[PDB]
Amino acid sequence: KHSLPDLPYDYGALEPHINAQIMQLHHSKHHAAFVNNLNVTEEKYQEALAKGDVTAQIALQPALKFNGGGHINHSIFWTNLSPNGGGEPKGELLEAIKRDFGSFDKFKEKLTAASVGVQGSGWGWLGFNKERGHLQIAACPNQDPLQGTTGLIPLLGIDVWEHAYYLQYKNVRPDYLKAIWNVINWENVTERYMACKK
Amino acid sequence: KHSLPDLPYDYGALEPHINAQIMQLHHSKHHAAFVNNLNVTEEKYQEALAKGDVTAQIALQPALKFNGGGHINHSIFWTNLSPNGGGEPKGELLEAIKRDFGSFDKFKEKLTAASVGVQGSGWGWLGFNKERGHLQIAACPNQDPLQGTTGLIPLLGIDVWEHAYYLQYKNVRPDYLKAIWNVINWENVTERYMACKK
Amino acid sequence: KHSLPDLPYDYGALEPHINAQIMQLHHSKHHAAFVNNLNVTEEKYQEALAKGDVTAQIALQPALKFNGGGHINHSIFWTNLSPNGGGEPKGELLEAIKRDFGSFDKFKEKLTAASVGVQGSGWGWLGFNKERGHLQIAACPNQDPLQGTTGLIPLLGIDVWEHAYYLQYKNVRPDYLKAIWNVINWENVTERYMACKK
Amino acid sequence: KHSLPDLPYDYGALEPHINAQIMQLHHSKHHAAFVNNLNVTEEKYQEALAKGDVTAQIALQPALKFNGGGHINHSIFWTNLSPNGGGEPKGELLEAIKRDFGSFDKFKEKLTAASVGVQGSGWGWLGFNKERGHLQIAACPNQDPLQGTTGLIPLLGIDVWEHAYYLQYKNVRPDYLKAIWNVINWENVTERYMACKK
Ligand SMILES: [Mn+2]
Ligand SMILES: [Mn+2]
Ligand SMILES: [Mn+2]
Ligand SMILES: [Mn+2]
Numbered sequence: 001k002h003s004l005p006d007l008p009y010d011y012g013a014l015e016p017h018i019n020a021q022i023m024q025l026h027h028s029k030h031h032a033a034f035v036n037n038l039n040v041t042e043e044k045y046q047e048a049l050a051k052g053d054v055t056a057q058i059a060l061q062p063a064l065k066f067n068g069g070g071h072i073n074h075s076i077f078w079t080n081l082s083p084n085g086g087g088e089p090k091g092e093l094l095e096a097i098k099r100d101f102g103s104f105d106k107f108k109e110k111l112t113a114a115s116v117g118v119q120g121s122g123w124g125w126l127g128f129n130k131e132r133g134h135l136q137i138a139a140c141p142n143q144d145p146l147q148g149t150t151g152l153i154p155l156l157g158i159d160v161w162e163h164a165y166y167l168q169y170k171n172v173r174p175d176y177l178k179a180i181w182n183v184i185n186w187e188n189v190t191e192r193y194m195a196c197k198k
Numbered sequence: 199k200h201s202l203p204d205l206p207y208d209y210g211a212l213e214p215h216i217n218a219q220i221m222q223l224h225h226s227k228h229h230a231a232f233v234n235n236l237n238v239t240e241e242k243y244q245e246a247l248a249k250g251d252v253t254a255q256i257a258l259q260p261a262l263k264f265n266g267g268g269h270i271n272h273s274i275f276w277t278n279l280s281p282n283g284g285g286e287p288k289g290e291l292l293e294a295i296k297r298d299f300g301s302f303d304k305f306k307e308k309l310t311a312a313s314v315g316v317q318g319s320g321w322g323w324l325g326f327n328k329e330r331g332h333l334q335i336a337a338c339p340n341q342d343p344l345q346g347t348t349g350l351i352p353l354l355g356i357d358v359w360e361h362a363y364y365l366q367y368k369n370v371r372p373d374y375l376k377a378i379w380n381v382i383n384w385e386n387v388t389e390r391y392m393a394c395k396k
Numbered sequence: 397k398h399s400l401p402d403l404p405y406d407y408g409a410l411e412p413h414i415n416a417q418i419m420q421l422h423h424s425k426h427h428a429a430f431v432n433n434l435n436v437t438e439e440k441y442q443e444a445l446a447k448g449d450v451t452a453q454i455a456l457q458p459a460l461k462f463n464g465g466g467h468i469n470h471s472i473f474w475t476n477l478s479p480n481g482g483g484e485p486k487g488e489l490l491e492a493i494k495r496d497f498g499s500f501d502k503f504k505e506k507l508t509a510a511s512v513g514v515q516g517s518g519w520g521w522l523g524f525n526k527e528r529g530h531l532q533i534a535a536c537p538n539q540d541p542l543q544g545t546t547g548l549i550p551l552l553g554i555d556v557w558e559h560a561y562y563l564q565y566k567n568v569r570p571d572y573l574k575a576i577w578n579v580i581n582w583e584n585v586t587e588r589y590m591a592c593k594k
Numbered sequence: 595k596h597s598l599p600d601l602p603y604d605y606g607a608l609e610p611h612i613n614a615q616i617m618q619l620h621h622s623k624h625h626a627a628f629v630n631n632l633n634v635t636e637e638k639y640q641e642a643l644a645k646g647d648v649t650a651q652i653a654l655q656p657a658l659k660f661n662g663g664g665h666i667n668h669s670i671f672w673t674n675l676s677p678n679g680g681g682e683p684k685g686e687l688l689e690a691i692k693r694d695f696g697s698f699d700k701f702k703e704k705l706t707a708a709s710v711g712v713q714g715s716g717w718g719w720l721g722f723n724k725e726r727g728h729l730q731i732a733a734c735p736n737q738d739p740l741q742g743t744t745g746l747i748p749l750l751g752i753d754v755w756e757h758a759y760y761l762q763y764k765n766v767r768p769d770y771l772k773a774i775w776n777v778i779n780w781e782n783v784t785e786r787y788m789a790c791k792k
Contacts, residue, residue, distance in 0.1 A: 002448070029369040038450070045453075046445060049438070052398070054464040057441075058544030061457050066317045068450040100726075119264050120340035120359070121318035132694075142318035148454030161318070162360035163369070171227040171361060199646050236648070243651075244643060247636060250595050252662040255636075256742030259655050266648040298528075330496075346652030425765040462713045515660050516736035516755070517714035538714035557714070558756035559765070567623040567757060 001039045004032050005075060013083040017179045019168040026074075030163060034070035034143075041067060069143035073123060076154050082185035089186035093193050100135045111158065112177050114139045121161045126189075127152030128196045153196045156189045199240065202233045203273050211281045215377040217366045225276070228361060232268030232341070239265055267343035271321060271355065278354050280383030287384040291391045298333045309356065310375045312337045319359040324387070325350030326394050353390045354382070397435045400428050401471060409479040413575045415564040422470075426559060430466035430539075437463060465539035469519060472550050478581035485582035489589050496531045507554065508573050510535045517557045522585075523548030524592045549592045552585045595636065598629045599669050607677045611773040613762045621672070624757060628664030628737070635661055663739035667717060667751065674750050676779030683780040687787045694729045705752065706771045708733045715755040720783070721746030722790050749786045750778070 007027060012020035041063045048056030088094060088104050101107035107126075114137050115124025125138045125146050130153060140146055146154045158180060165176035205225055210218035239261045246254035286292060286302050299305035305324075312335045313322030323336045323344050334350055344352040356378060363374035403423060408416035437459045444452030484490060484500050497503035503522075510533050511520025521534045521542050526549060536542055542550045554576060561572035601621055606614035635657045642650035682688060682698050695701035701720075708731045709718030719732045719740050730746055740748040752774060759770035 025369060042445070049442060049445065054434070054460075054468060055541065055544045058461055058464060058541055061461065062317065064450075065454055065457065068454060072450060119260070120320075145451065145454055148451045163364060166361060166364050167368075171223060171231075200648075240643060240651075247640060247643070252596075252632070252658075252666060253739065253742045255639075256659050256662055256739065257745075259659065262648075263652050263655065266652055270648060343649065343652065346649045349653075421765060458713065515656070516716075559760060562757060562760050563764075567619060567627075 001042075002035050002071060004035050005078070007078050009081075009083050014081060014183050017183050018081075018165075022164065022167055026159075026164060027078075031070070031074045034067045034074065037063065037067035038071050065145075065148075066143045069140075069145035069148065072145045072148075073143055073157065073159070077157055077159055079188045080156050080185055081183045082187070083183070085183040085185050086181060087186070089190055091190060092197070093186070093190040096135055096193070108181065111137050111156075112174075115158045115160050116173055116177055118160050124158035124160055125152070125154060126156040127154055128193060129153075130196060130198075153192070155192045156184070200233050200236050200269060202230050203276065205276055207279075207281055212279055212381045215380045216279070216363075219365055220362065223365075224272070224357075224362065229269070229272040232265045232272065235261065236265035236269050263346070264341050267341040267346065270343045270346070271338075271341055271357070274352055274355050275357055277386050278383055279381045280386065281381070283383040283385065284380040285384070287388060290395075291384070291388045294333055294391065299335075306379060308335050309354075310372070313356045313358050313375055314372050316358045321358060322356045323350070323352055324354040325352055326391065327351075328394060351390070351394050354387045397438075398431050398467060400431050401474070403474050405477075405479050410477060410579050413579050414477075414561075418560065418563055422555075422560060423474075427466070427470045430463045430470065433459065433463035434467050461541075461544075462539045465536075465541035465544065468541045468544075469539055469553065469555070473553055473555055475584045476552050476581055477579045478583070479579070481579040481581050482577060483582070485586055487586060488593070489582070489586040492531055492589070504577065507533050507552075508570075511554045511556050512569055512573055514556050520554035520556055521548070521550060522552040523550055524589060525549075526592060526594075549588070551588045552580070596629050596632050596665060598626050599672065601672055603675075603677055608675055608777045611776045612675070612759075615761055616758065619761075620668070620753075620758065625665070625668040628661045628668065631657065632661035632665050659742070660737050663737040663742065666739045666742070667734075667737055667753070670748055670751050671753055673782050674779055675777045676782065677777070679779040679781065680776040681780070683784060686791075687780070687784045690729055690787065695731075702775060704731050705750075706768070709752045709754050709771055710768050712754045717754060718752045719746070719748055720750040721748055722787065723747075724790060747786070747790050750783045 004027070007023075011024040011027070014020075014023055041060055045057065045060055045064065048060070089097070094104065097104055097107045101110065111124055111126055118124065118139050118141075121142045123140050123146075125140065127136050127138055127146055127150070128134075129136050130151070135155075136152055138146060138150060138152055140149065146152050146157070158177070160173065165173065169176040169179075202225075205221070209221045209225070212221065239258060243255070243258055243262065246258065287295065292302070295302055295305045299308055309322055309324055316322065316337050316339070319340050321338045321344075323338060325334050325336055325344050325348075326332075327334050328349075328351055333353070336344060336348055336350055338344055338347065344350050344355070356375070358371065358374075363371065367374040367377070400423070403419075407420040407423070410416075410419055437456055441453065441456055441460065444456070485493070490500065493500055493503045497506065507520055507522055514520065514535050514537075517538045519536050519542075521536065523532050523534055523542055523546070524530075525532050526547070531551075532548055534542060534546060534548055536545065542548050542553070554573070556569065561569065565572040565575075598621075601617070605617045605621070608617065635654060639651070639654055639658065642654065683691065688698070691698055691701045695704055705718055705720055712718065712733050712735070715736050717734045717740075719734060721730050721732055721740050721744075722728075723730050724745075724747055729749070732740060732744055732746055734740055734743065740746050740751070752771070754767065754770075759767065763770040763773070
């Protein structure tokens, strides 16, 4: 079974950028809903798998992808943020971003464009392509996890569901996007980059 | 060509079930953004169709369905809501909700369950199947409209995008559902049934 | 594990309607490919499920839906056909078709229209809706199984992939559709209807 | 407005790798059906756009992308095939296939694997990413064209719909793949690279 992990900071440590009412809620409600549904569904999968029931397996695919991706997606999201966040990353990570996007600001503009373009619920991502050996930007719908659905390795993600900035920025998604860069834990993004730089 | 329709009531006429902020933001900011972007899209479309560009016609599709449906979907919504609605309809429409869904009991439950079940942004609909002559409950993702995508005639629709209840009801989608049944304009729901009960 | 079931007739028992070169091939090659992939994938599912790996689970969803649906779909397909097929069904099944589609020929025209309209690979289906208590016609893409993906109970299906009539009818799909009605095992379609008439 | 382009060679010029029947049927029956239905669709489109009908514009979309892309996809295909092609390209394009995919060895393998992997009807593509200035291997479902759906510039495309190899190669898709490499017009593949190597 899975569990809800604690945050590496407080519910209000991301203020004024990300409201505390949003943070506690995004964690305790939304993210918590995900892990339980994930556990219930996973067991309903074990029931039909041993049973040899393919119809049941297939019927359980959407719930499993939604709650499972919700789990995976948000878990990586928390570690991407930090009260000691913002600025430009350093070392090899910044060189890769330069080698692949020209500069840090060109990279910023694009991840902003891809996240602001998601119609309905989705996520903006910065991923490492293990095969071609370079960084890519991708957008995923609802809770579809980046790696499970694309093979790209998730370095940095931006939750652009309306429950992630509405209480604060309302229908204005670019304001939230302008702000998110000030709480980004580049320590972690580099950390995830070293693991797959293999 | 397309105009933001005026609400047939004041921004706070549906209070307490839907607070005045949500209606103002929904109508003014969201619905309006669809009209404005639909206009630019159809204009960009005449341009590509005119100079036989099929790659541009295809690339423009996502935006047209999104903004086009956003405008279609919300204009309906405003007419389905009303200060003096709620409860139950009057025989003919009720006579139908009866026969096709058991009773208003199970009809509410059916629509509530379709709406609550949407993963991410979407809508729950009570439509009319003009072939079969039967009522149907259909859920559309994002801003995909009933008719254009499924062929069903829209009678009553419930927006379940998070911008429709988050400020008030927050994370509890089902709370937004039990409360919406109060502002439902059964008079208008009936109006759509009649023009198609043929 | 799963296996390839034998046909309730010979590879040429459906001539002149369905070629024998098509029949043996559709079974021994296409259908056989499905069951093995189904078994390999199912075990790769058990590996990651016990491991608690959600990324792997999600990555294996498409193969599992395609080979699993391919298995389910074709298995029902064989029992739908018969050298002693064709004509109109009798008893309750025909009354239901009349009560839901007006007549047998109106039903025929529609299942023909839905199967001839599939763009790319897909299946035409006649299903029983357990909840609304009546027959419906639906079309599914590639190998997506009807019940697992819609809840409808599969009574009769028409494989409209190009590997199902090309050697014989070439790009002409309606000819194959005109012919398929002459080998339809209505004994079985009624049989599947009794089970869900519950 | 749209015309069925004439083949730049005889229906049997690519023999023995693609037999004369397949080319005749592909070009004459399939490709033609797309042109004819694309024309009727765009005409139906001007009509709905003209009288501000957004429901009809949306309902017409599936057909436009299907026939529109069918015409786009095949017209390319004919120019990518040729009596005297095969082997390897000449430096500039080869210089690129080298850098981005390792070597022609792994480039063939990469495209072959993308094509063989399609579930149902589709295409494998070698495109140009005009931002990154890099070559990319992309697979499109049904008749969804590269550019209109992904933004990549199409350089070389392999049809994997069953009507492209079934009469000859039958169920063995990979046999059709190893054989197609022989008729590949590297001269034309180069032609598309040049106009975009900017
Ligand atoms: Mn979230
Ligand atoms: Mn809305
Ligand atoms: Mn088949
Ligand atoms: Mn083709």
